[model samples]
Target: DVCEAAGKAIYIVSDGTGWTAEHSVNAALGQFENCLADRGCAVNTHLFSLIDDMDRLIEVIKQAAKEGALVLYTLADPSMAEATKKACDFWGVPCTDVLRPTVEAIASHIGVAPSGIPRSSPSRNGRLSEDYFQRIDAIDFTIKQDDGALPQNLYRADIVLAGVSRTGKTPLSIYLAQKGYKVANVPIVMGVDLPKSLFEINQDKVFGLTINPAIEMDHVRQELVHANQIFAQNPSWPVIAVTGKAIEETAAVILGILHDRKQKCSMPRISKRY
Candidate 1:
C-alpha cells in the first residue's frame, strides 16, 4: 500500500501579537514532525492577530471552517473568547482555547478575577514602567557578557549558558534577556579553561548546551567532546540538548526548569481575598 500526501491547515487566532499561540502550536507540532514526514503530509499555518471585534472574528472562523482548519486561539476578552467558542461550535470546526483555562485556574486559585485584557493592549498611559527598564538592563547585560566576555561577571547573571561554538548560545541568551533574564553565554574552546568564577557561582544557575555533531572537521568534534566532559564533570549543571530545536523551544525548556526550581524553593503561599 502506498501512502498519499495530504495537506492540513491550522488557524492561529489571537487578540494580541499571537506569539504565544504560535509558539505553543509550533512546539507541539515538533512532536509530529516525523509522522508528517513519513506520510508526506504538509501542515500550513495562518495567523490572524489583533482580532478585537466580533465581525472580524466571525469572518476568520468562517474562513477556517471553509478550509477545514484546526483553530488554536488566545482571546483575552471574556466576551471574545465566549463568542469564538460559540462560532466554532456552530461551524462544526475543531478549536482550542490556548489561554482561558490556565487563566481561569489561576484566577480561581487566587480568588481573584483576571483583568481579561490582552497583554499587548495599549497602556492607559504612555509612560514607561519598571519592567521595561528591567528588560532593557537585561539586554544590555546579556550583550556585554556574550561569547565568553565578562566571565568575571558570571555571578551577576540570572542564567549562565556554556556551549561550544555555533551551538546557538548567543541567540538563546539574547532571547532570554528580552524576557528580563540576565543571561551570560560562554564558549567552550578546546584547551581553554572556563572562568574560575563559573564554577564558584551557584551551579544551579549554570546550564550546558550540547548539540548533535554536525561539523565535518576533527577539531569541532574534539571541541564538542571537551564540552561534554565539562558538563559531565559538573553534575549540578543541567545539560540541555539543543539539536534540531528552535531557539524558543530551548528557551522554554530553560525557563520551565528555572520556574520549577523557583517554585520548589519558594515560601509558603498565603491565600487572601482581594
Candidate 2:
C-alpha cells in the first residue's frame, strides 16, 4: 500500500509455496482482490513472486521500500517469515505477518475510510479453475491434431482429398496441407456409409478431393494390373466422370464434385443447385 499523503512504507512476505508460482500466488490472491474490489474497496494491487533466490527477494523488498507502500508477509511457516524480517530489519523497515492489515492503514491516508461493510470475498476458484482447464484442454487437442496432420490447421480448405487406395490422397493432402490450409483427407469405402460424424462435424469445414475416373482407373491400373474386374465393379468410378458436357467445362466438373459434398464454408456457392 502506497499512501502518498502520509508518506509510509512496508515490506511483506508469505510462505514459499503460497507466494511463488502462478497456481499458488495469482490464483489465491486474485480471488481476494476481486472480492475486495467488488465491495468498492477501490484498491490496486501489484503482485510479485520470487524464485528460490533470497538475494533477489531481498533486492525486490529494497525497491518496494522506496515506493512508499506498506509491506506485509503472510507465510504459513516461521522460517519463511524470519528471512523476510531480517531483510526488512537490514533495510530499517518494519515488516508484518498479516496480509490484510494494509486495507485499513491505507484507508486512513486516503480519507475514504471504510464503512465497515463486510464484503464476502468468495473463493472464485471454480470458474477460474474451469477457464484454466479450458485453455489446457485446447492446447492438448491442438497438439494431437497437429502431431501427424498439423501445420495445416486452417478453416478454409479449398481442395479436399478423399477416396480409397492409390488415389494420391495422402500426398495430395500433404501437398495442399503444405500450401497452408486444413486439408483433411478421409478414406471412403465403396459400400460402407461414411460416419455421420463426417457430416455432422461441420460439413462446410471439409473439401472432397477425388480424381477423374478415367485417369483414376489408369493410375490404379498402373499400380495393380489385375484390378480389371475390381475397376469395373468399383462404385466411386462414376463419381469421377461427372459430365464434361456441362457448360462451364472442367472447372465446372471439379467444382461440381465438391458440390456433391454438403460442405459448409464461407465461400459463395459456385452453382446454387449443383
Candidate 3:
C-alpha cells in the first residue's frame, strides 16, 4: 500500500564540521529504506556546521521547529545539549543528541571525565586537531581515486601518479595519502590512452613513475617506455624512479617535490610536537 507523503527535513547540527551528526543520522535512516520508498517520503538533510554560539543554535532550532524537521546534533558541550533538548521539547519537535549517551557510558565505564570538546578523543591530547581530520579526508579521497577509478576527480588530487603496474603506484599513493596528500594513481598500459582529465589537470601536480629496466620484464619495459613518452609530452611532469628505493624514501622524494612547489602536506611529526 503506497501512501502519498510530503517531504521531511532532517537538521544535522554540530559544533565542528557536522560530519558526525550527518553520518549518524544517515546511517540510522538507512534502515528505513522500505518505509521511505513505499511511503513516498522525501527526506532532505540540512547541515548546520560550526555551530558554537548559543544565538545561532537557537536560530537553527527555531527554524527546524518551524519546518517540523527532525534534529540530530553532535554537541560536545553539556550545556548546549541540555539547551537543545529543552528547546526541542518546548517546540514539540523531535530531537536526538547523537553523541552524549555513548560518551557518558564510556566515561562511566572508564572512570574518566570527558573534556567535552568537539572533535576530541580520550587520547593524550584531548582534542583531535584539524590536521588529523585533513589526513583522514585525504586518505578517503586517495582510496576512492586509486588506479584511475575516478579520473574526473583527478583535478582535486594534490598529486597524480602515472606508471606501469607494480611500479608501487598503489603503495606510494597510500603512503602519500597517510601524510595528508590526496593522491590518485593511474595505470599506464601499453596502448590505452591516458584519461583526458589527467592532461586537463594542473600539469605541475602530475608525476610519472619509472623503474630500472634491469629489474622487470619486457612487457613492463614497453609499458614504462610508453609511460615515459607520455611524461615527455608534459615537460613539467617529473619522472621519479622507484627502483631500489623504500616506500618511505619515495614518499619523502615526492613530499620534497611538493614542498619545493609550495604545496602543503601535513606531516604528523611537524603537526604534533611531543
Candidate 4:
C-alpha cells in the first residue's frame, strides 16, 4: 500500500568531488529502506558539487527546499558549512551535514584544528589528478567502442571485450576505462554477424564475457518475442551475474589480467587507437 506514495528529492551538496557525499547518503538511505520497506518512496538524487559560490549555491538549495527536497551536504570549508546551515534554517527544510560529527571527533582526538581546505591531500582526500584525466580519456574511448560500434577499430584498443547481449560487457568496459585502460566491447548475438576484424585481433587482448544458460535462454527468447523475430533456441550464457559486487570484483579481475599482460604490451601505448 505504501508503494503508492509520491517520490522524494534528495539534494546532496558538497564542496569538492561528490563521491563521499553520494556514498554516505546512499548508505544511510539503504539502511532506511531496509528497516522500512513497506513505507515506500522513490528517490531522485540531485548532486551539487564545488559549491563555494554562496549566492549561486544558496539559490539552488532554496529552490530545492521549495520543491520539498531534503538536503544532505558535506562541506569542508568552515564558512561554506555555516552558510549552508544558515540557508537550511531559513528555508525550514530537513538538512544534515553528513560528515560533521566524524570530522569533529577526529579533529578533537588529534588535538588540532582542521585546515578546512576542501580536498586536502594530507587528509588523504583530494580531487582527481592526471590519472583521473587519463581515466576520462579511457571512458570516452570505451563509449565510442561499445557493443561493436566500430568493430574494425577493435584492434586499436588496449583490450577488447566480446560477449552475448546483456552479459555485462558494457559495464565492465566502462569500469575498466575509468581505471585508465582503453576498452572496446562487442556483442555476440547468436547467428548475428560480427565484424571480421574482431576475430583477427590478438587473442591475449580479447576477453569474452558470458551469462548462465537458464537466464540467457529466457532473455534471448523474450528478446526475439519482443522483436517479432525468431532464432534457434540456444540455452547458454556465463553462470555469473553482474551485481554491484560482481562488477567491482570482475573489474579487478580484468585489471589483473591487463596488468599481467602489461609486460608484453608496447610502452606509451595509445589508450585509443583512432
Q: Candidate 1 on 64-171: residue-level lDDT in tens?
A: 888889999998889898899899999999899987888999999989999888765775435677887989999998887434455566878898898888689889
Specify the poorest-scoring 10-residue window by lDDT in model 4. 229-238
Q: How many angstroms is residue 249 displaced in model 2 relative to the true structure, after the best TM-score fit? A: 56
**Position 14, candidate 2: lDDT:** 40
What is candidate 2's lDDT per residue for 183-250, written digit by digit as tens?
55545554444444444444444443334445344544443433333334443433332223322243
Give the number of the best model, judged by lDDT: 1
Rank the candidate models, highest lDDT first.
1, 3, 4, 2
Native-referenced Cα lDDT, model 1:
0.84
Model 4: how far residue 258 lies from native, Å = 5.2
- In model 4, state the lDDT of residue 80: 81
lDDT of 2 at 100: 36
Candidate 2, poorest ten consecutive residues by summed lDDT: 117-126
* 68-145: candidate 3 lDDT, tens digit per residue: 899989888889899999999998899988888999999999899987776533344455678888999999988775
lDDT of 3 at 81: 91
C-alpha TM-scores of all predictions: 0.70, 0.26, 0.50, 0.54
Per-residue lDDT, model 4, residue 212, is 47
The TM-score obtained by model 2 is: 0.26
